[PDB]
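Hello everyone,

My group is preparing for a crystallization screen and wants a predicted model to guide construct design. The compound we'll soak is 1,6-di-O-phosphono-beta-D-fructofuranose. Before spending weeks at the bench, it would help to have a computed complex in hand. I've included the protein sequence and the ligand's SMILES below. Output in structure-token form would be ideal because that's what our pipeline reads.
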Amino acid sequence: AFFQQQQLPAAMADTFLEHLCLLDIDSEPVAARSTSIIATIGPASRSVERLKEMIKAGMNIARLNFSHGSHEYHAESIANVREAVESFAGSPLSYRPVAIALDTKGPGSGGLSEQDVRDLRFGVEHGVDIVFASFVRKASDVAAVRAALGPEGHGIKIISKIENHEGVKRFDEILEVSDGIMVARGDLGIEIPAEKVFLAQKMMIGRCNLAGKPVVCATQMLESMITKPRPTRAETSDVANAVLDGADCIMLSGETAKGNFPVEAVKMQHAIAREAEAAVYHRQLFEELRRAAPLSRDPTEVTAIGAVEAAFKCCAAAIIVLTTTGRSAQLLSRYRPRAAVIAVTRSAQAARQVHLCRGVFPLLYREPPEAIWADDVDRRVQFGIESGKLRGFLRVGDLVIVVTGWRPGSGYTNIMRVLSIS
Amino acid sequence: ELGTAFFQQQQLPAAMADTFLEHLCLLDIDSEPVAARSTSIIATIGPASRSVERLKEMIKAGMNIARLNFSHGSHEYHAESIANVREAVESFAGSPLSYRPVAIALDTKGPGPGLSEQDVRDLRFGVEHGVDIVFASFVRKASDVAAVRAALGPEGHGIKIISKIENHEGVKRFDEILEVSDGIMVARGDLGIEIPAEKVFLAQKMMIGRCNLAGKPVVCATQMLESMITKPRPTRAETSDVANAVLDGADCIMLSGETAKGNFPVEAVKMQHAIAREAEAAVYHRQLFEELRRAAPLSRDPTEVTAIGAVEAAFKCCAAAIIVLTTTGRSAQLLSRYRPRAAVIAVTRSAQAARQVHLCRGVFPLLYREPPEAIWADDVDRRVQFGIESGKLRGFLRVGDLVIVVTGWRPGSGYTNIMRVLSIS
Amino acid sequence: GTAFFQQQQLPAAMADTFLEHLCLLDIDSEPVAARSTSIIATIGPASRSVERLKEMIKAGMNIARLNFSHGSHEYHAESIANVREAVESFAGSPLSYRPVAIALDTKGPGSGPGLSEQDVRDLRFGVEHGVDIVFASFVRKASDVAAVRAALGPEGHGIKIISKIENHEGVKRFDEILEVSDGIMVARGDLGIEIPAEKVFLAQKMMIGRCNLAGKPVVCATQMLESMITKPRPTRAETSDVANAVLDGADCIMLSGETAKGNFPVEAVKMQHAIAREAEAAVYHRQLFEELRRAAPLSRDPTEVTAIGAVEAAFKCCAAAIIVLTTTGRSAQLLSRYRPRAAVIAVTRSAQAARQVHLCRGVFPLLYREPPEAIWADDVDRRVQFGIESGKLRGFLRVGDLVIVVTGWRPGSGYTNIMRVLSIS
Amino acid sequence: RADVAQLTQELGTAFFQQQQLPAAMADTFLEHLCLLDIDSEPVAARSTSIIATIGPASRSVERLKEMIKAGMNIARLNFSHGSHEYHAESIANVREAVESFAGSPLSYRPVAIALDTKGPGSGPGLSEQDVRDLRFGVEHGVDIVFASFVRKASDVAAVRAALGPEGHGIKIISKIENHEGVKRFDEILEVSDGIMVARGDLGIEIPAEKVFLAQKMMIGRCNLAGKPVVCATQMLESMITKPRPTRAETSDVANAVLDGADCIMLSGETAKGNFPVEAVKMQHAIAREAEAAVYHRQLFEELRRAAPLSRDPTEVTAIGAVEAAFKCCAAAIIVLTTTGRSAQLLSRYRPRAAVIAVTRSAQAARQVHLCRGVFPLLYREPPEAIWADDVDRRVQFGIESGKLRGFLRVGDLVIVVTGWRPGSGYTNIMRVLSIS
Ligand SMILES: O=S(=O)(NCc1ccc(S(=O)(=O)c2cccc(O)c2)cc1)c1cc(O)c(O)cc1-c1ccc(O)c(O)c1
Ligand SMILES: O=S(=O)(NCc1ccc(S(=O)(=O)c2cccc(O)c2)cc1)c1cc(O)c(O)cc1-c1ccc(O)c(O)c1
Ligand SMILES: O=P(O)(O)OC[C@H]1O[C@](O)(COP(=O)(O)O)[C@@H](O)[C@@H]1O
Ligand SMILES: O=P(O)(O)OC[C@H]1O[C@](O)(COP(=O)(O)O)[C@@H](O)[C@@H]1O
Ligand SMILES: O=P(O)(O)OC[C@H]1O[C@](O)(COP(=O)(O)O)[C@@H](O)[C@@H]1O
Ligand SMILES: O=P(O)(O)OC[C@H]1O[C@](O)(COP(=O)(O)O)[C@@H](O)[C@@H]1O
Ligand SMILES: O=C([O-])C(=O)[O-]
Ligand SMILES: O=C([O-])C(=O)[O-]
Ligand SMILES: O=C([O-])C(=O)[O-]
Ligand SMILES: O=C([O-])C(=O)[O-]
Ligand SMILES: [K+]
Ligand SMILES: [K+]
Ligand SMILES: [K+]
Ligand SMILES: [K+]
Ligand SMILES: [Mg+2]
Ligand SMILES: [Mg+2]
Ligand SMILES: [Mg+2]
Ligand SMILES: [Mg+2]
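Reply:
Good plan to model first. Here are the tokens for the complex, ready for your pipeline.
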């Protein structure tokens, strides 16, 4: 029965054609949903009670669209999100961190606009985790956003939105200096022929997967759900194909900001993503990712590949990684393991930001410290295991891969352990 | 010889890639499609697309198959639709550059345990009116297909039966249904209500893959450009859906309300045409052909053996087209199963076969009407040159191009065994 | 039948990985196909008698090597005459006659920089006596090949030049030598003294791989069955060496002292024949054909395009043979480069081409002696029938087998463009 | 190029020109062959073990010291010839020559002693002389038994029973020398520690032109099973009377290594020939060239795909360690082992990195020579009070001996494989360490 669930017959197939033929509608998904859901906050999703429902439905990142609304409006939104998130902090083994992202208005007719500088300053002051920089056309646009974030905003992640021909053509230079990319299909579909957008989406997702950087698929994913309780056949297909393409995050705009079914739209994206993740052809995917990733003398990079290889060999339920900045979890994520990457961190900001990486499940470690570093480490490992058992990721008898470092401080991951649960 | 510009068009850098990841990374929005659109467009005829003038516009936009939905309307209504389609098609019989045959398909109302009384009457209507295809609704088992086949009276055995899979039973009994059907339609509308909406993409991808493996046509249907019923442009999810159905391996893409009752029927056809052309150039032929080749079983049928040699030969020289002489369409279908990048120009004396080959991806029919030559070898040469002259006239061929010619050793269907490499003069 | 798929290592040939392939090798799986790797035997005192030469032709000798490092022109002319007498002693049965090529192995430059004066005299002797191949000793650069070609003059245009790589310079300048040569010989004797003995296997594997990539014949030579000069059976290392040269991709295997001066010249030929047959069945065609196909560049030459379609077609039906009509042998060489499991039966009227095609693996020459038919298509059919009749007589074909026939559209060399699937009657 | 561009800038273009690295990075096997370079020098230590047969030509303690320096890893005693007194003198001479280098335990070279049985002859099973010879082996502390003419699983059970309770640690390598042994191969391999492809008798029992098929099949199955396989007989036959081998002989040795043989053997070449040391030197030189020419890109992928899923932490750690070593071009994998099993599981994935096995067991240190790429280090120090410190001292001993023998340099990356608790069977940790 284990090998009949989560499309395992289709995952073992020798060819991609055999893989497609073996897809079974009766093979149920078992693993936790790996692709993060970004929901846009607006009138339909601003109440603390509504936001609690969206967190339970699966929202991982809350997007504030600075194209509409005042700073007072957005600060109220931020406060409501934080209130709804902290309403579940009572049970630290089941608490879900939610990132806050600021989507800039953009340059419009103009480089970096004066309103954008004021909005970016607002984001730093209000402690946002991510910036979705609108209409990025070159590497110098990213540098301008980075400069506007100042010294207090070094930790904020910059996700460049590609929305026009220039951004697509200069993609490589933008990706090099960005933390990730958003495939902003709305404007892109007006700037380039609508029938060419799928080529740009597939190219940008592929390059981001190659680079190991997060990529978000955005706009009109479940558009009809703004007024209707169920999406169209094209919409469910679109969500599924974005996940199959390799998107780290999927987004909802009007569907959650102004629609009549914001919670239902989140539930739909959650349901589709789970099905699509089980349908991933890991046999060729892991091989291609392995072959494409360059040789490395960075021990974190070397431990990540060894850990993902080890997890595939034993069908590990999870890979528990200790991370400070989230980097060790990101390097595990780039190899697209079938095993969940449970990232145990003390940094609340890192816990929110690792939602950008597919398959990373952040656990904010709030237990009291241990005096001996070795005991402190073991405690954070056992923490990941208890939360994993509570949340359904792990059972007694399961195998896990534990990824740690040799000394405290970020950048020293170099150990991989094969551990049996209880 | 061909130029650097030749190798930058139709996603050729992405097609030459050693891995699927490299292939995705090499996709270029500036790489323009050159080949003719190979995925057929099925448009549903209704109040929005019934007039002879409106139908002429849809043929020019790219409609290859006209679907008559027998869930709505009387026999008198559908016979008027058939007559209007035939009138609009024959309005271009003068100009060989604009004349294209259009298939007529009957979509049944559906069942009850088995074939309904109304369905038997509707199938009899189809035989009497000379329809080419039947889209049999709610097929759940092989005996359902046999019932449709039996209902296609003594005169309708040439009609193609495309079984619509619309429920859990049809998905579970897929293999037995495909074995006895001519092809499949992934009827996503009802399927999305019978099974969880989030599982439909799995059923679509599985059924397309199995149809590609079997060498049988598969249609992706319902809500492809749904918003275009009221809006002139589709959503980002809708264009993505059409593109992904083509990339998945669908032979045909369909329009229902978009053409039958919508405000932009011609614009919806134009949109599907535009997306399909882009998506066909983005197909990863390097791994696709290898997998199709490896998966297809060994064969001692000369048509099947010639088809693989012809597709292999066409890939080797970047052949502008594969010209195949076929009477039933079978030879063109066997070429099509290997998914060549070259156009399959099928020269036939059969008007029905010319209409039905629209079900197979990349098959471009040419109806030949010349009186037969006394020497068979001269009749073959005359039909082969007609394929080249038409090709030249339509933009597929130029002097200096290479084409692969597939013929047989003796007259009559079933003897295809020759593949020739010809230089266009 | 089940028994068919148990012979000639077919389970090992169908394996998904190279590791699975090795694990499936069966010592009880008997070779059925004809031995495709040619045997070159050096003529000397042990193999000069007309009766002895008839035994070597029956044992499997395809090419007779005349070593111009030893003996006078008078000696070599007597050799040539004895070979031709023994070969023509079987010309009474044209359906079973075996052509034998005559190759001249030059003495070399020695201390000189380029072509020696004795080499010029020996090369002109070869042209005067009608030799087919030249094994040019110690080739170090492309200009060495040009010098041999110039010394052959205008009358020696058809002679094939196989460059012997015997030193570090030849290995380093390999690419420029191969570009201008008809093929290569891996002269392991001198090479093993010029470079460290433990590095020779790397040079052999590299040169064979590059020759296979280029589609040019490659010969593995020297000490293959060395112990058989005095002993009736070879060592375990010697049989392994012969088998591995075939598995590496060598078109020809050679015997030097083993046939020229040894006590068991016929037994050495029989041993090489037996090992090569075993090794050819153990070839992993699944990956090999895929790699050859992928590595070969796109082509607008119809012969090149027909060859790949024909090999692809032969694999699809497990064709017993590919019968090709050839004037120069080039059409057979282009089929051979794709390493088909099917025998390439080359029917030719050129006695020289019939002798030279022995350089290409899996090409079985048939010299057709009949005068032309007035109708060219009838002449073409008669030759094809001759191939079928010879192949039936020799055991390559049986009634019911499928065969691929490769012909051209007009008389004369360079016009191959047709591939046909034929059932043996 | 981008998949090796950063590491190329770091390690240099000269690094990537050595040990057939361009040929090893090739996308196809055809490209791999085309890229083989005679100028690309081997850098890695010779990983295929050399088994030399001891006889009149190689019995003296002085001659044996020369053979150990030439590369001999296993000494074979052929019980088809000679008395027990003769073989005991041979064993004593081997041990004397081996211990003459024990002064420096950081550079000492352990040598296994293998007993090759006479065989059943006319009989159906284990002969009476074989029982006496096997008892002799147990009494004299031999490490391996090469059991002649094994034809079924019950033959290896008989050898195991004849070894008695004290010979439980001895490895049984079954010799396949006839059609029955080839046909029942799977049942024999299941119960054996490894196999020897005994080509001499096999070449007389089956057609000589079919032996290469049997060799290639048995090596492939042994590689798939993760068990040692020895290629034997007539490898450098001409070197019995001549100082240089033939072109077929060098080719044969190279092809046995390329086929996947863990060990290569010398029989008459060392036992009775005129050039026993030269034959060992030749096999050493060829094996080093052949190992660099291995197409690791497809090999590792195939080994990985063929090996079944495992819930054994040693098995899981071994594949993660080999994958990690390939990612950074690790100079070595240092593994702590008691029985040699952890080193054997690393070896089955055919890493290009040397597997430096640190052990306290002298028998395990001798027996790991059966596994390709395993370099045994016998640790003689007394245990530390804290187990974690004892472990670290052993790891450091491996790093220091690896630097001393040339395997490691400052700046190199190494993968360290250890367990979480003392005792055999608990390997579960993989560490990436930078050499300082
Ligand atoms: O290796 S993959 O898993 N599969 C990729 C693949 C997709 C198509 C084709 S084909 O040659 O067009 C084809 C062949 C046969 C039948 C056909 O109908 C089509 C081959 C291989 C993967 C790797 C990536 O680098 C990535 O970025 C995403 C994917 C990917 C793509 C689609 C999936 O369904 C999926 O699970 C993963
Ligand atoms: O595709 S091939 O058939 N073989 C290709 C191949 C050979 C080795 C390796 S491996 O990665 O080293 C390896 C993998 C697994 C187990 C192992 O023990 C070894 C993989 C694949 C072929 C192609 C040519 O370009 C050619 O010139 C000759 C051959 C060839 C070589 C050896 C044969 O046994 C054979 O039949 C053919
Ligand atoms: O992903 P990052 O930022 O490199 O953090 C991983 C770090 O986690 C650790 O295992 C634990 O260290 P801390 O005690 O600082 O939490 C480090 O040794 C390692 O460097
Ligand atoms: O695709 P189909 O129905 O098998 O038709 C292919 C047939 O067409 C031909 O090429 C031409 O034959 P006709 O003259 O009868 O049209 C035959 O030789 C071949 O058998
Ligand atoms: O292999 P080559 O030398 O190119 O010769 C192939 C030629 O042989 C033929 O099949 C038969 O021609 P001939 O009648 O001149 O022998 C030609 O059609 C073709 O051009
Ligand atoms: O390879 P083996 O025989 O399983 O031994 C590996 C064992 O060696 C160790 O690394 C060290 O253990 P010891 O203290 O017994 O020498 C263990 O942690 C591990 O279980
Ligand atoms: O801004 C966006 O997200 C877009 O344009 O799609
Ligand atoms: O009938 C159809 O096409 C459907 O239900 O999707
Ligand atoms: O000339 C040769 O053939 C040689 O030197 O081996
Ligand atoms: O016994 C042996 O070693 C043989 O037969 O080769
Ligand atoms: K915005
Ligand atoms: K209907
Ligand atoms: K010579
Ligand atoms: K013995
Ligand atoms: Mg926008
Ligand atoms: Mg329906
Ligand atoms: Mg020489
Ligand atoms: Mg023996």
